[PDB]
Design a protein around this ligand. Sequence first.
Ligand SMILES: Cc1cn(C2CCN(Cc3cccc(Oc4ccccc4)n3)CC2)c(=O)[nH]c1=O
Ligand SMILES: Cc1cn(C2CCN(Cc3cccc(Oc4ccccc4)n3)CC2)c(=O)[nH]c1=O
Ligand SMILES: [Cl-]
Ligand SMILES: [Cl-]
Ligand SMILES: [Cl-]
Ligand SMILES: [Cl-]
Ligand SMILES: [Cl-]
Ligand SMILES: [Cl-]
Ligand SMILES: [Cl-]
Lengths: 211, 187
Amino acid sequence: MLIAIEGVDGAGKRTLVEKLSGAFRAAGRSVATLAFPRYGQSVAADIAAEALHGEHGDLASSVYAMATLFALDRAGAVHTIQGLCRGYDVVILDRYVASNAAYSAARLHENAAGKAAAWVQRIEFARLGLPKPDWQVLLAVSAELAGERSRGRAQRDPGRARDNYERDAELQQRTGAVYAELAAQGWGGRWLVVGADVDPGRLAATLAPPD
Amino acid sequence: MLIAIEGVDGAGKRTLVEKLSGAFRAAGRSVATLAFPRYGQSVAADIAAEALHGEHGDLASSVYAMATLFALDRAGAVHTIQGLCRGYDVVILDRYVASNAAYSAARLHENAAGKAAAWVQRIEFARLGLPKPDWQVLLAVSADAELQQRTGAVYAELAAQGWGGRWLVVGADVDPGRLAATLAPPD
Ligand SMILES: Cc1cn(C2CCN(Cc3cccc(Oc4ccccc4)n3)CC2)c(=O)[nH]c1=O
Ligand SMILES: Cc1cn(C2CCN(Cc3cccc(Oc4ccccc4)n3)CC2)c(=O)[nH]c1=O
Ligand SMILES: [Cl-]
Ligand SMILES: [Cl-]
Ligand SMILES: [Cl-]
Ligand SMILES: [Cl-]
Ligand SMILES: [Cl-]
Ligand SMILES: [Cl-]
Ligand SMILES: [Cl-]
C-alpha cells in the first residue's frame, strides 16, 4: 500500500508520517518512508533547491520549470518506490505528485480544474509513469500555525532573513485551497482530510482496515 | 581526444562533422560522434524540444530554464561521452556546452563576458563535471534573425577569449585534411 502525506509547508507532515508509521507497526505492518524532493540523489532536486534560494537566474520564476524539476526528481525514484512497495506492507511518502499540482496551480492563480494541475497529472502519471498512491492524506491545519512553522520558500536561511512574509503567506492560502479541491475531486485516487490531533491507531485502521 | 563543433549554422556543422570524421579516418584514427541536444534519447532534451513548440506552459520563456534542460541532458550523458573517449581515438560532439553559453547570452542580450555564459560554465563544467574538450571548433563562415546574429557574436568572443579551453575558428571550406592534421597532428 502506497500512502502520500500532503499539505502546506508547516502543516506538520513529518510528525504525521512518524505517528502513522508507529501505528502501522503496532498493528503488525512493516513500513518504509520516503520524502520528496530527494536532495543529493538527483541533479533536478538540487537545482530546484538552489533556484529557491536565488541561484540560476530566472529559473524559479517559471512555474512549469520548477514543476518539471520536481517531476524529474520523482521519475528518478520510481525503482525505489516500486522496490519499497515490494518489500514493505506500507510505504508512506512525505509529499508526492499532488504537491506539484497544488503549488503549481496556486502560483498561477488557477484552481484544481485548471491547466497546471492537469499538466502535472499528464506528465507525472501518464508520461513518466509514477505509481498512483492508494491514499492521499491531506493534513489541514490553521493558516496561523502553518505560517509560524513554515521556513518559507528559502528553507536553508535562518529565520531572521525572511523578507517575503506576505507573498509566501498568500501563496500558502491559495495552495491550501487547491489541495482541498484536489481532495474533494479524488484527484489521483482516494483522499482523506485529517487534522493535527488525528489518532494514529484509528487513522491506520481507516487506511488499512483489518481483514 | 574530445572535440566539440559549435556555431549557428547546424546544417553546416553536420557537414563539417562528416568531412572532419572522414579526414580523421583517412589518417588511421577511429571516430565516434554524438549530437546535443540528444533529442529522442533523453527526457530533458525532449521536454526542451516540446517547450520550443509551445508545450509546458511558461517554461520556454525562461532562458535559464531552457538552459537548465540542456545541461541536464548533458549531465545524463557523462558516461556516454567518457565511454566514447575510452573506446575511440577521436570523439566529435555536434554542439556542446558552449552552445548553451552562446544561445543563453544572446537570448538575454548579454555578451560572452556576462552572467549567463559564466553561469553555464560554473554549472556544467565546475559543478556537474562535464569533461572539458580538447578543442572547440567554431564554424564562423558558412558556405529570429537578430537572435542568430547575437548568438554568432557571442560565439566569436567566446572563441577569442578561450572560453572553456582552446578554440579554432574556421570557415566551411577549410581543407579537412589540414583541419584533422591541426586537431590531432600525425606523428
Ligand atoms: C515535492 C514538491 C514540493 N514543492 C514545493 C513545496 C513547498 N516548498 C517550499 C515553499 C514554501 C513556501 C512557498 C514556496 O513557494 C514556492 C513553491 C514552489 C516553487 C517555488 C516557490 N515554497 C517548495 C517546493 C512543489 O512545488 N512541488 C513538488 O513536487
Ligand atoms: C546543445 C544546445 C543547444 N541549444 C540551442 C541550439 C539551437 N536550437 C534551435 C534554435 C534555433 C534558432 C533559435 C533558437 O533560439 C532558442 C534557443 C534556446 C532556447 C530557446 C530558443 N533555437 C535551440 C537549442 C541551446 O540553447 N543549448 C544547448 O546546450
Ligand atoms: Cl510540514
Ligand atoms: Cl517496519
Ligand atoms: Cl534545501
Ligand atoms: Cl547562480
Ligand atoms: Cl510565486
Ligand atoms: Cl579523450
Ligand atoms: Cl572557408
